[PDB]
Design a protein around this ligand. Structure first.
Ligand code: FU3
Length: 210
């Protein structure tokens, strides 16, 4: 288990998002889905010069899996995924050029759904999630898991669970008062609102253990 610190601006934003109120916290789903689509875009781009790269899965898509038992909403894509370095760099440690700008707009009163515009729309998941786990697998590396509950740091281990062919899985351990987003009905409407121009298939798998 490795522990890493967040780049100071990202760490600062996370604390702003967590502690500020918005009437409007569901744009986080738009964001993780946009991310997934870009990942899909990416592996698709790579495969145009090398078919073999799709030997870890020909289908390109996004699943949504609300789990009420475990109070977790999961977003899964068979996209490009991340190598270990990719994971450590892109989910906290390297400065994103839009972080400052976005914090100023928030200051000026900008609504939170602006966040997509600044390339930091992932950290919006912490509007609804006390904890986030990202499990990723890239053709060029083994499978890893990234964890953070904010508070300045994240961790990275290898993940032993169910091997993905390829892609990324963002698991949201929801806050107590954010459980409406496990509601099938709530997820139907949200996708229909913020994600009707996503060029990949999106399926809703409702998970319940017996
Ligand atoms: N679903 C999903 N997949 C991926 C990523 C994210 C993501 C996360 Cl978890 C957190 C944040 Cl802050 C942003 C994110 O994405 C922004 C769009 C990235 C783009 F998709 F364009 F690659 N989310 C990141 N990834 C890589 O960096 N891959 C390396 C490119 C070489 C392999 C795959």
């Amino acid at each position: 288990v490795e522990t890493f610190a967040f780049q100071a601006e990202i760490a600062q934003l996370m604390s702003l998002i967590i502690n500020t109120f918005y009437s409007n916290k569901e744009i986080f789903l738009r964001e993780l889905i946009s991310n997934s689509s870009d990942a899909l875009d990416k592996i698709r781009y790579e495969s145009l010069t090398d078919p073999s790269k799709l030997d870890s899965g020909k289908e390109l898509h996004i699943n949504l899996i609300p789990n009420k038992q475990d109070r977790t909403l999961t977003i899964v894509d068979t996209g490009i995924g991340m190598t270990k370095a990719d994971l450590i760099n892109n989910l906290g440690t390297i400065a994103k050029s839009g972080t400052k700008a976005f914090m100023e707009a928030l200051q000026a009163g900008a609504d939170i759904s602006m966040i997509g515009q600044f390339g930091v729309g992932f950290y919006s998941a912490y509007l609804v999630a006390e904890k986030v786990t990202v499990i990723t697998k890239h053709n060029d590396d083994e499978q890893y898991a990234w964890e953070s509950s904010a508070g300045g740091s994240f961790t990275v281990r290898t993940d032993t669970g169910e091997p993905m062919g390829r892609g990324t899985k963002v698991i949201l351990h929801l806050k107590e008062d954010q459980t409406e987003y496990l509601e099938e009905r709530r997820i139907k409407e949200i996708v229909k609102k913020h994600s009707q121009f996503i060029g990949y298939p999106i399926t809703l798998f409702v998970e319940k253990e017996l």
